[PDB]
Write a structure and sequence with these properties.
The structure is a homodimer of 310-residue chains. Chain A has 310 residues and is an alpha/beta fold. The first copy, chain A, has a single domain, classed as TIM Barrel. In chain A, 39% of the residues lie in helices and 13% in strands. Chain A contains 9 helices and 8 strands. An 8-stranded parallel β-barrel of chain A has the order 1-2-3-4-5-6-7-8, surrounded by 4 helices. In chain A, α1 runs parallel beside α2, α3 packs parallel to α5 and α7 runs parallel beside α8. The longest helix of chain A is centred in the middle third of the chain and has 24 residues. Chains A and B meet through α2 and α3 of A and α2 and α3 of B. Chains A, B: It is an enzyme of class 1 (oxidoreductase). Chains A, B: Its EC number is 1.1.1.-. Chains A, B: It holds the Pfam family AP_endonuc_2. Chains A, B: Keywords: Oxidoreductase.
Chain lengths: 310, 310
Amino acid sequence: MALTLSLNTNPLVNRFAEPDDLIETVARDLRLRDLQLTHEFINPSWQASTIRRLTRDMDRALQRTGVRVTSGMTGPYGRLNHFGHPDRDVRRYYVDWFKTFADIIGDLGGKSVGTQFAIFTYKDFDDPARREELIKIAIDCWAEVAEHAAGAGLDYVFWEPMSIGREFGETIAECMKLQDRLTAANMAIPMWMMADIDHGDVTSANPDDYDPYAWARTVPKVSPIIHIKQSLMDKGGHRPFTAAFNAKGRIQPEPLLKAFAEGGAVDNEICLELSFKEREPNDREVIPQIAESVAFWAPHIDTGAKDLKI
Amino acid sequence: MALTLSLNTNPLVNRFAEPDDLIETVARDLRLRDLQLTHEFINPSWQASTIRRLTRDMDRALQRTGVRVTSGMTGPYGRLNHFGHPDRDVRRYYVDWFKTFADIIGDLGGKSVGTQFAIFTYKDFDDPARREELIKIAIDCWAEVAEHAAGAGLDYVFWEPMSIGREFGETIAECMKLQDRLTAANMAIPMWMMADIDHGDVTSANPDDYDPYAWARTVPKVSPIIHIKQSLMDKGGHRPFTAAFNAKGRIQPEPLLKAFAEGGAVDNEICLELSFKEREPNDREVIPQIAESVAFWAPHIDTGAKDLKI
């Protein structure tokens, strides 16, 4: 395998804002090349000229440091209805918003952008006929974004499977059913998924649906980026065989990676996901623990630090 | 006391979107009059005409149902740097954003709008000179918003004290020090706080700083709205005196209210705060548990249901 390693910038939002500060900390303190940039740092809602100015700043910092933006994703403050919003003008706003997000990420050298497929209201989801009708509408929104993103130089767009019905793809079966549909839609550039192996409906009568190993074996050929929540991983100092191999908080990297391999992973980006409460001492454990997480994976997946210039 | 009762719409975001659906559910299912509307339902970022159309829709639903919007606050997807953003043009965007939020809330009959005072980056907060300089800048942003909001018919604007330094007001002392400053600034309409009695720096060497009773006794004269997290409250079926009276998860309404009274509360709005994970069965316990929370307070604080028309 030639996996690569990246970090979703979720936990760096608010705590960092200036591109130099963000990108120099990633390079110096995290020793990681690749990032999934979240929307909060250069927001598609802002004035067009502000976006351009900050994109130039960010691009200079990437070039100077050797850090790379490989994709864009909605951050913690972008988990919205979006293309599942029942208002036509609201949907239109977010279509144009995601078109600009694609422009930003393309400018920065990244190759894809995405978010949840959609998030439906109880009202829109619970009436199965309305649900299906809104799904067709949401697909057509994705299609529009994909066409613009092609022009911005992206390779694909993506959706993130979640853990309840109205946020989509909550079982492996539903997730692959939706993906089959988005592949068939034949967009200007392909639409793929970005699976999070910690996601899935925990109340499922199918234990696979919330088993990180089952997701690992299923997604790699349709999920170019794959999120791994670091909290899933064994931190050491437990007696061996005191928990299940697939117990969340006790998972080990070597066999997990083998599972991705059995799933047909060859050059997926493995994207680290961490969160820290805005309370002490958690708020000040962010850089140290992300650094630690990168060093955790470094023997298993190349971190790209050989390309850092500082 | 003539306290009133309201609900922050945080847990209704995503799950509801259409004004009729939102407001009719509040009236029929929650049996509550007053709401603190979050920004996600009518977003100040959207097209001007969309905002107007949705504000008219929302206002019709309030009039029809008897429900009232008494304030606006940033929802879960609005917890940003805002006036602590180090970029001048980003700050400008959010100033204008909050001006429109004030227009929306004023249109709807509400009397205030707010958010965190600011959220600072590590870089801006940790250099004490830069911190102070950015605080003056953030105050002047508030002043601009307050002047516009006066024109929109609001009575005041507000900040929410948080639980770490860089999010402001993390100890009672710091919170009252900042408030003294914002009062002195003499804005077009007053700037007050909206305290959350569950907030405060848990690592403080002062136990009062994360004691809901200490906040209760301190804030009422400077905090017209006060958030109460429902998870703080005793749900019943515990043996008496098996936990501290002020233990979070074991607090009782009668003595808490007495504490607010000792703090000089007369006609504060008590605003209920609840959250539900986007996982089952939590995602479908939202309406039932909010309904239950309202019925929990109803013997203690009038819910305003006498004014509901449906």
